[PDB]
Design an enzyme around this catalytic site. Structure first.
Site, PDB file in Angstrom:
ATOM      1  CB  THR E   1      -0.939   0.036   1.225  1.00 27.07           C
ATOM      2  OG1 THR E   1      -1.848  -1.074   1.169  1.00 27.07           O
ATOM      3  CG2 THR E   1      -1.737   1.351   1.278  1.00 27.07           C
ATOM      4  CD  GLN E   2       1.851   1.654  -3.776  1.00 27.60           C
ATOM      5  OE1 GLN E   2       0.631   1.629  -3.607  1.00 27.60           O
ATOM      6  NE2 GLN E   2       2.425   1.309  -4.928  1.00 27.60           N
TER       7      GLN E   2
END
Ligand code: MG
Ligand code: MG
Ligand code: MG
Lengths: 235, 212, 240, 244, 233, 222, 204, 195, 231
Positions: E1-2
């Site tokens: 996740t970014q």
């Protein structure tokens, strides 16, 4: 010394060829396939009279519709039977159905050549896998430690195999009944067995569509032996 | 959901409702909340439907492998413990299960094991699980006797689901009945709650509050 | 890891490492198993070459796997301890999961499975041990006696012997043991077990060990004096 | 590949023997003799150092007698380096047991553990076995005073009196001749030294060629004391018994 | 996740009678900052495919390298690499779609919305969409981000269904695309005047147009607009 | 935070006849208030006379269908080209779904076909693999609008025979394929009127012993 | 919630003339509930003494661990461990659990057998050594102990005077702490004799 | 589960454990035996989170039974309690800790003494004359502090235990459905069937 | 002699005897023929039985809708290699929506067999394969050897007495290549080719095994009364 997975100059795997020699030393097991069912029979061959012969388990259930007879180093068969039972049950779990006899046999034979330097040697046991499915009907397979399996109308394995196979060559026809097959196994077993055939040193079994796989009682087999003697004395 | 099971003279009665809901929405009225593990063993469904279906079907596979290896019918104790040990491995992961593993063997007699996704495993004589369990318990506790006939016991299980089906909003649809004997379970049919309610009301004289 | 295939087939179809494991059993002290009508007796030989021994603490030949099953053996002593440990763990594991103690046949099948595994696994040699496993199934009064061997095969026996000079004591048992009417009492069964060992043992002093197993977890090991009384009675009847 | 050079340490002979175990026992037969004698009021451990030198620092030296814990000691016969590997493992097992149960490890349990480790090297791994035979002298509140021996096969047995190493045949006969059940520690000390004095390959038995130890209840009240004898103390007991 | 950092806005596209058109502006935004004005977001693969990418630019550059690597790999042990066994738009899309879904399933997505525009071997128009979730769909017109809300309505007035595709010429289709790009410049606060346009035709092949600008803009009416209600001056 | 799930809208409907089965679904694909595609096929022919749709999150829907089609292919290889029966397919799909029990395929799966006795069959799945054979099942966005209508018009629920006044139920007479298709079309026409995510087009797959046939119908595009 | 104040209790250690003293209360509790009045917090390995306050399971676990380690030390070194060496061992052992520590406040006390020098040391839960000349305090009434020790303590006290100082420091500190008390023990340690005294105190 | 008590008298150990098993809203059982025999002269009662309690108790039982067979010898109650503590101390820093509190009542055949050990889920062991877990001690300890004597008979211990249970039944809001009482002495373990 | 103990050892003349012994297993195996035109590709296989009671060992395996092979030698090794091909064909379809090129399928088989010849412990595959397929560049026929060598051919044969069929195809080359849009005539040429490798025994109904793939023809195997037409 030499590799376990080595080819001979003739183009055969030494260890596989040597395991076949061990199977020749094993007790006789005979299978006969008919349109009314498949019959499996074995020589128990107790090493002493004090050995309780009913504890000799050389005929074994894999599923309700698949049976199995063995010959050779019978201790090696236990993991093969375990795998077969697991494969049969696992397929039923995934697909809500019985598993094909050929597919079961193929699953067993996949283990065969998983040896090297996986297990340290091939299996020292041959299996007669008998069963029934809706697609191909009554079937009898011969599973070797080479990983090869042949379907048979009738087949004998063990020490009296080549002599029994020649007898099965003449006797088998496509219109055999189940009762005729039962007596025929008992006839050929009695021929190749060292000791005299009775209900304690020999065992019968069958697989039918209705009743499934069944190992015969010693009382039931005793009557078939008595029926055999009379019909041979009849001419 | 409302599921019950109780031991008696004639074996075990298993009774369940048939409703499935997603919030207020009634997804189904024809859900099977009795898993036929094998011809001798039954399991009820409560909490997570998939979790119960999957693992009790799986349990049947394990029971089959047991009796192939051991050449003997698996005990209700052993069968229930295979399931409880399995769900206990998954403890914390979020499995949702509340089930009765029911069976009738020689050595044990009629036996019921309540099994839980928290790992709980309880042997008992009467069990009710689900959102309508409290309603079913009332009818059971007041009318239960060990010396019930198979006919009366079947009715008691049917009437107890009906009690819950009426009051509990998340229970209803139809009633499924089973009778577990030593030789195996026997199915005693699907009974629509709509038709059953009026039938019971008239014949029994109960539910006087409701206008019919 | 060490992956070398030690147990392999030879041109004549034999696995020499499994067969040489039997030769280790042949060298081991004699062990005998006799089942009566309501009991099983396990006789064992103790070679008298080793004196100045402490018989209190010295590992006994017969070992309890559970409260209702026992295991005796012939062959490599160190190897036997590994099978005994595995069997004892499996016995408790069975009770824990199945909520019922192991049957004698099941425990036999497990030990025999371990022995088999070592005949086709890489980097391991077979156990130089044959076992006699005896006891009574839970809530059952029928006596059980089983034998295992390095290859992994197992079977049930009315009476059986293993170890050195086991050919002689098997010869004795084959003529003296009647299937139609086995040793009815504990005395008769123990007597026949001691008699069979007296064909081989040499002296009947501390060389014979006897363990009697009865139904409902009733296992007891006989003392020197108790066994000596059997040895005395046998030879006095023989002088005729 | 590598298979060509493999000695195959864990295989049976045609006769059913383990080659490497048998050859390790042959190795141990050339090691200095170690003797254990169990009495009613204690245990004696006596052992012979192999052809020593005059420049060897004896008082700080230890090749035969080692301490496993306060209750259990061992006499070594074979490769000293191999023994120390096993001794440290045994010391750890005793401490693990003590940590778990809050009770000192029973002698047999410790002996079984070490013997099982030796066994493993004979059945799997493809490594050579430990060329070591132990005599275990110890005490616990179940069986009291106990003597054991283990060898490279992993087999162990209990004893009243026992020898390992060189000339065990001669040594065991001498012990079998003069040992009695009602014997005491001071008598066992005399027997042990007399046995070594006759079986030794040296011209004479002296203090500098010996290691000696006793496990006694001869400690203040109900408890057990290990005594590893110093060079001067071994010299005194040799004069007392009348050997020098 | 970014979270996405340097981003590219709308990619728009449509089918016409002989092929497909695709367009995207040359801006790499850094939040509200219009940081990079020379970013090419249409990446051709061979002479028959153009992959238009929006969203995170660092992930775009990664995808750009995967496609460059795909062409190299296809040429290995392949005598027909420039003929029968050349890369098709359908092969290129399915590969990306697999990657996008695999990455979302590992909870580490390529933060993009991708449109693969091209012409197949048999002359069939290819136009399909895939995004960070691995969601895929095809339509006569496709657009990402703001394009979905403003471009599609305009492009759908030209090709409203499948039967309108053979009736639409390249000149009409290009005109609609160019107008949509102007509308997006008026109304998308993360867009630029400079853009690139690519046409993949089954006859004339791949035509790649760089350094295009939005022109014919209406602003004159702004002079008359005064205040926010009551103000006259 | 990254949200790996999404809602692509759509509505599907499976109905089991006496000797046939239908699986219908609208062709509209959406996110939020935007239309992605007016024609994006949702119901698929998977071979062996089985039709399937996995409605909900389209990426998971496509992944599941792809994996099931793959399962059919490998079932043939491993078991001598044996036909995968609808019941066996159903159990296989349970294991595919439950395999991701702790990171589910966010879809409501329905398959349709014929059982081994030739009768019509429809199976319905929840996201994590609980399943059941059913006569009638609507799935997706407008499922709550369609199912009550089907209870009334297929199973004749709450309908009684005139004159008897609640004493005799309307008899459960068998519906023909032409009669089912009318109810399917009216269900989707009604759903289109009252549900914003439903529209554009209706694609119906009809399964009989002769094979799989397709029918397409226009829906309102607003 | 806070692991270091669930069970409660205190340890204090002081140096004197050719002697050290270490003392502890006897309370073990479950927060408000008093559970045991015999839970001793001072242990010894040879002539080295170790007090441990904090979470009781860890007190027990660490005692068993240092018994384990000092026993192996003795077998290999052929001599009993010294206070200076043991302090480093306690520090090493605590820091190896840096990101999952034992919730304790250990206190080492003893006299070096060779030099005859009195030695005390304290640690935080993570192994940081506090080697003070005067005194070390630990537990749920450490503030109270700091206050008592800082005023009552003077250097070079004789064993029988030191006993009174450490006893009064402990007792009065424990009476101002809800989770400490329920009895107390004081060790007076000299080079070759150790006296252990149980103190009489209020049992509330 | 809820309430488990223990009291060591002159020549035995008495463990009292509640019979109720509640599942949130309903009481599913009122005859549950919250105890396992670890060895002939050692009994362990238990209370804590569902599943964990029985899983832990049976795991301990299996291990002690295994030790009994291997050594042909019964471990002392002290040795068993130390083994149990270590398992719980190992458990508390695990991925998912056993949420189980236990009382171990045993009779040491060597010392001819009864012994009661209290161990919580953290691995906090204490030897006591009388003990409890959870809220049980809050109601009962004041009575035990008052009446308890180390030379009490088994009959007197049961009378004091009845007084504790009566106080629990009066002041506790939860209905624990009475208690099952078991006595551990030189002759082994037996259940008081009327209480 | 001294250099045939394992596959990792070159002989003094630079030979790999274990690979050559694996090659020998193929010659012992039953004959199978492969041939193609511009439209279709055909496999013909003489199945072998153990005895009169036994079945005839299956020789032909399907890998995909457009590809498959016939085996000669160790059947279990063919099962391993065919399974691997099935996966690679399937990987190409799933990931790239692309049918695997027959030439690329050969490259994969070569590389898999090669790894077994260079590493210690393992062994070469003891089977030869004839792969047919129809891809984007038309019909194809490959010959796989367990040495690793894969060869694209118009026609070929492997197994016992395979030289007779191989010589026939070498003469017929110009005829059978032109059999376009006629599967029956192409099979006839294959059945006539395999007949040159027969001695004593002849082609019976359960003996013969034929497979075909082409332009508008998925890979299909014909056994039993289906091949009675061509006898
Ligand atoms: Mg389990
Ligand atoms: Mg609209
Ligand atoms: Mg207070």
């Amino acid at each position: 010394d030499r590799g376990v997975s080595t080819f001979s100059p003739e183009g055969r795997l030494f260890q596989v060829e040597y395991s076949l020699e061990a199977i020749k030393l094993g007790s006789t097991a005979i299978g006969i396939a008919t349109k009314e069912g498949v019959v499996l029979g074995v020589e128990k061959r107790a090493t002493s009279p004090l050995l309780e012969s009913d504890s000799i388990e050389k005929i074994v259930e894999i599923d309700r519709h698949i049976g199995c007879a063995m010959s050779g180093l019978t201790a090696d068969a236990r993991s093969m039977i375990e795998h077969a039972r697991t494969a049969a049950v696992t397929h039923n779990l995934y697909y809500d159905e019985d598993i094909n006899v050929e597919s079961l046999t193929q699953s067993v034979c996949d283990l065969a050549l998983r040896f090297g330097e996986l297990m340290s040697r091939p299996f020292g046991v041959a299996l007669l896998i008998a069963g029934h499915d809706a697609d191909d009907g009554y079937q009898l397979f011969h599973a070797e430690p080479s990983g090869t399996f042949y379907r048979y109308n009738a087949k004998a394995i063990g020490s009296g195999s080549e002599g029994a196979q020649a007898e099965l060559l003449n006797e088998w026809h496509s219109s055999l009944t189940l009762k005729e097959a039962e007596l025929l196994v008992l006839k050929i077993l009695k021929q190749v067995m060292e000791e005299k055939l009775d209900e304690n040193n020999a065992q019968l079994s069958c697989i039918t569509k209705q009743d499934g796989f069944k190992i015969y009682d010693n009382e039931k087999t005793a009557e078939l032996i008595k029926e055999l003697k009379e019909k041979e004395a009849a001419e | 959901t409302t599921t019950l099971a109780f031991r008696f003279q004639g074996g075990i009665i298993v009774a369940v409702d048939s409703r499935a809901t997603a919030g207020n929405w009634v997804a189904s009225q024809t859900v099977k909340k009795v898993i036929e593990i094998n011809p001798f063993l039954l399991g009820t469904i409560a909490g997570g439907a998939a979790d119960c279906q999957f693992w009790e079907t799986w349990l049947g596979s394990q029971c089959r492998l047991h009796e192939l290896r051991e050449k003997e019918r698996i005990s209700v104790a052993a069968a229930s413990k295979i399931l409880s040990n399995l769900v206990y491995q998954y403890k914390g992961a979020g499995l949702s299960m509340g089930t009765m593993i029911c069976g009738y063997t020689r050595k044990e007699g009629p036996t019921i094991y309540y099994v839980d996704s928290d790992g709980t495993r309880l042997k008992g004589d009467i069990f009710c699980v689900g959102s309508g369990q409290t309603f079913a318990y009332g009818v059971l506790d007041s009318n239960y006797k060990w010396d019930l006939s198979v006919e009366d016991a079947l009715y008691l299980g049917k009437r107890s689901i009906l009690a819950a089906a009426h009051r509990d909003a998340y229970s209803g649809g139809s009633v499924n009945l089973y009778h577990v004997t030593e030789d195996g379970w026997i199915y005693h049919g699907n009974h629509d709650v709509g038709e059953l309610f009026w039938k019971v009301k008239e014949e029994e004289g109960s539910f006087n509050n409701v206008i019919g | 890891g060490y992956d070398r295939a030690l147990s392999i087939f030879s041109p004549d179809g034999h696995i020499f490492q499994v067969e040489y494991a039997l030769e280790a059993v042949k060298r081991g002290t004699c062990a005998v198993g006799v089942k009566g009508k309501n009991c099983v007796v396990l006789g064992c030989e103790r070679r008298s070459t080793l004196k100045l021994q402490d018989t209190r603490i010295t590992p006994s030949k017969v070992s309890k796997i559970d409260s209702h099953v026992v295991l005796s053996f012939s062959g490599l002593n160190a190897d036997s301890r590994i099978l005994i440990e595995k069997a004892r763990v499996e016995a408790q594991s069975h009770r824990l999961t199945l909520e019922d103690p192991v049957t004698v046949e099941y425990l036999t099948r497990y030990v025999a499975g371990v022995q088999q595994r070592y005949t086709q696994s890489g980097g391991v040699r077979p156990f130089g041990v044959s076992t006699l496993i005896a006891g009574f199934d839970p809530r059952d009064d029928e006596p059980k006696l089983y034998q295992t061997e390095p290859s992994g095969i197992y079977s049930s026996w009315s009476a059986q012997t293993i170890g050195r000079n086991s050919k002689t004591v098997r010869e004795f048992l084959e003529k003296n043991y009647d299937r139609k009417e086995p040793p009815a009492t504990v005395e008769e069964c123990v007597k026949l077990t001691v008699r069979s060992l007296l064909e081989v043992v040499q002296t009947g002093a501390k060389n014979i060990e006897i363990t009697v197993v009865k139904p409902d977890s009733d296992i007891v090991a006989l003392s020197s004096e108790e066994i000596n009384q059997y040895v005395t009675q046998i030879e006095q009847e023989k002088q005729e | 590949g590598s298979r060509r050079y493999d000695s195959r340490t864990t295989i049976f002979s045609p006769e059913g023997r383990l080659y490497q175990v048998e050859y390790a026992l042959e190795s141990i037969s050339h090691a200095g003799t170690a003797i254990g004698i169990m009495a009613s009021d204690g245990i004696v451990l006596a052992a012979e150092r192999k052809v020593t030198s005059t420049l060897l620092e004896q008082d700080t030296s230890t090749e035969k007698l080692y301490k496993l814990n306060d209750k259990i000691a061992v006499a070594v016969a074979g490769l000293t380096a191999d023994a120390e590997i096993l001794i440290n493992t045994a010391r750890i097992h005793a401490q693990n047991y003590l940590k778990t149960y809050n009770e000192d490890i029973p002698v047999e349990i410790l002996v079984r553990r070490l013997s099982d480790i030796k066994q493993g090297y004979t059945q799997h791994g493809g490594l050579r076995p430990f060329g070591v035979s132990f005599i275990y002298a110890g005490y616990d509140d179940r069986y009291g005073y106990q003597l054991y021996t283990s060898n490279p096969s992993g087999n162990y047995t209990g004893w009243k009196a026992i020898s390992v190493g060189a000339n065990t045949s001669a040594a065991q006969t001498l012990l079998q001749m003069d040992y009695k059940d009602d014997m005491k520690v001071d008598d066992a000390i005399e027997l042990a030294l007399k046995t070594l004095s006759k079986t030794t390959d040296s011209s004479a038995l002296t203090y500098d060629r010996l290691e000696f130890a006793t496990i006694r209840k001869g400690a203040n009240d109900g408890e057990v004391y290990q005594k590893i004898f110093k060079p001067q103390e071994i010299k005194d007991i040799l004069v007392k018994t009348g050997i020098t | 996740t970014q979270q996405p950092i340097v981003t590219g806005t709308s990619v728009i596209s449509m089918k016409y009678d002989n092929g497909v058109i695709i367009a995207a502006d040359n801006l790499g935004s850094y939040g509200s900052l219009l940081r990079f004005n020379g970013v090419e977001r249409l990446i051709p693969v061979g002479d028959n495919t153009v992959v238009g990418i929006s969203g995170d630019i660092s992930d775009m550059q990664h995808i750009e390298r995967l496609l460059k690597d795909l062409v190299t790999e296809n040429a290995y042990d392949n005598p027909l690499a420039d003929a029968e066994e050349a890369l098709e738009p359908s092969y290129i899309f399915e590969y990306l779609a697999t990657v996008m879904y695999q990455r979302r399933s590992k909870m580490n997505p390529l933060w993009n919305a991708i449109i693969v525009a091209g012409v197949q071997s048999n002359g069939d128009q290819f136009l399909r969409y895939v995004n960070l979730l691995g969601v895929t769909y095809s339509s006569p017109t496709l657009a990402t981000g703001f394009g979905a809300h403003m471009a599609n309505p305009l492009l759908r007035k030209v090709v409203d269904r499948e039967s309108d595709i053979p009736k639409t010429t390249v000149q009409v289709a290009e005109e609609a695309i160019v107008n949509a790009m102007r509308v997006l410049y008026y109304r998308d606060a993360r867009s630029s005047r400079n853009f690139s346009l690519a046409i993949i035709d089954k006859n004339t092949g791949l035509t790649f147009k760089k350094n295009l600008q939005v022109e014919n803009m209406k602003w004159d009416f702004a002079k008359d607009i005064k205040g926010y209600g009551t103000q006259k001056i | 935070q990254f949200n790996p799930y999404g809602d692509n809208g759509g509505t599907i409907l499976g109905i089991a006849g006496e000797d046939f089965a239908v699986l219908a679904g609208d062709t509209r694909n959406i996110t939020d208030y935007s239309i992605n595609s007016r024609y994006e096929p949702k119901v698929f022919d998977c071979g062996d006379n089985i039709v399937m749709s996995a409605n909900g999150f389209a990426a998971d829907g496509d992944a599941l269908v792809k994996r099931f089609k793959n399962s059919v292919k490998w079932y043939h290889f491993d078991h001598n080209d044996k036909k995968l029966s609808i019941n066996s397919a159903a159990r296989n799909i349970q294991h595919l779904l439950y395999g991701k029990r702790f990171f589910p395929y966010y879809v409501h799966t329905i398959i349709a076909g014929l059982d081994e006795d030739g009768k019509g069959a429809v199976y319905s799945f929840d996201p994590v693999g609980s399943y059941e054979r059913e006569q009638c099942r609507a799935g997706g966005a407008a499922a709550s609008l369609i199912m009550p209508f089907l209870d009334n018009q297929v199973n004749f629920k709450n309908q009684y025979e005139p004159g008897t006044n609640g004493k005799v139920k309307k008899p459960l007479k068998y519906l023909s394929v032409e009669e089912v298709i009318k109810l399917v079309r009216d269900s989707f026409t009604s759903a289109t009127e009252r549900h914003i995510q439903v529209g554009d087009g209706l694609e119906i797959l009809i399964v009989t012993k002769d094979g799989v046939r397709k029918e397409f119908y226009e829906l309102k595009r607003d | 919630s806070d692991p270091s104040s669930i069970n409660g209790g205190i340890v204090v250690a002081m140096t004197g003339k050719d002697c050290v003293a270490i003392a502890c209360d006897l309370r073990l509790g479950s927060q408000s509930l008093g559970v045991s009045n015999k839970f001793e917090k001072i242990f010894h390995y040879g002539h080295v003494f170790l007090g441990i306050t904090g979470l009781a399971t860890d007190v027990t676990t660490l005692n068993e661990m240092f018994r384990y380690k000092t026993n192996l030390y003795k077998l290999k070194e052929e001599r009993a461990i010294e206070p200076e060496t043991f302090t480093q061992l306690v520090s090493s052992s605590l820091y190896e659990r840096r990101f999952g520590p034992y919730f304790v406040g250990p206190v080492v006390a003893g006299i070096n057998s060779k030099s005859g020098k009195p030695f005390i040391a304290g640690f935080d839960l993570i192994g940081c050594i506090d080697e003070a000349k005067d005194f070390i305090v630990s537990g749920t009434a450490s503030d109270q102990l700091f206050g008592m020790c800082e005023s009552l303590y003077e250097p070079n006290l004789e064993p029988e005077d030191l006993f009174e100082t450490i006893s009064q420091a402990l007792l009065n500190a424990a009476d101002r702490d809800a989770l400490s008390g329920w009895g107390a023990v004081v060790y007076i340690i000299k080079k070759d004799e150790v006296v252990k005294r149980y103190l009489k105190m209020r049992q509330d | 589960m809820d309430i488990i008590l223990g009291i060591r008298v002159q020549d035995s150990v008495i463990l009292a454990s509640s019979k109720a098993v509640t599942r949130g809203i309903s009481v599913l059982k009122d005859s549950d035996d919250k105890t396992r025999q670890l060895s002939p002269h050692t009994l362990m009662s238990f209370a804590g989170e569902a599943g964990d309690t029985v899983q832990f108790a049976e795991y301990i039982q299996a291990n002690i039974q295994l030790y009994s067979i291997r050594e042909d010898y019964e471990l002392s109650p002290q040795a068993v309690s130390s083994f149990v503590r270590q398992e719980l101390a190992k458990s508390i820093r695990s991925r998912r800790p056993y949420q189980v509190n236990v009382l171990i009542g045993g009779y040491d055949k060597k010392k001819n003494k009864p012994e009661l050990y209290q161990i919580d889920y953290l691995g906090t062991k204490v030897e006591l004359p009388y003990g409890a877990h959870g809220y049980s001690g809050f109601y009962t300890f004041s009575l035990l502090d008052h009446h308890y004597r180390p030379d009490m008979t088994t009959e007197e211990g049961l009378d004091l235990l009845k007084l504790c249970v009566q106080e629990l039944e009066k002041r506790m809001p939860m209905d624990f459905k009475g208690v099952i009482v078991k006595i551990v002495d030189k002759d082994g373990i037996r259940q008081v069937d009327d209480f | 002699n001294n250099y045939d103990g394992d596959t990792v050892t070159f002989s003094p003349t630079g030979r790999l005897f274990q690979v050559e012994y694996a090659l020998e297993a193929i010659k012992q195996g039953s004959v199978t023929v492969g041939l193609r035109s511009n439209t279709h590709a055909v496999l013909v296989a003489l199945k072998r039985n153990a005895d009169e009671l036994s079945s005839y060992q299956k020789k032909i395996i399907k890998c995909d809708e457009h590809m498959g092979l016939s085996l000669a030698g160790l059947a279990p090794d063919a099962r391993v290699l065919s399974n691997y091909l099935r996966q690679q064909c399937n990987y190409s379809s799933l990931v790239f929506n692309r049918k695997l090129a027959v030439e690329r399928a050969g490259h994969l088989l070569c590389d898999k067999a090669q790894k077994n010849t260079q590493s210690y412990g393992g062994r070469p595959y003891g089977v030869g394969l004839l792969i047919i397929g129809y891809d984007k560049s038309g019909a194809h026929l490959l010959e796989f050897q367990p040495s690793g060598n894969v060869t694209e051919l118009y026609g070929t044969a492997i197994g016992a007495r395979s030289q007779g069929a191989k010589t026939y195809l070498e003469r017929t080359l110009d005829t059978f290549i032109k059999i376009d849009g006629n599967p029956d005539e192409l099979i006839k040429a294959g059945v006539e080719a395999i007949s040159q490798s027969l001695r004593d025994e002849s082609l019976t109904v359960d003996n013969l095994s034929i497979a075909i793939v082409g332009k508008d023809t998925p890979f299909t195997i014909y056994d039993g009364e289906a091949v009675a037409k061509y006898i």
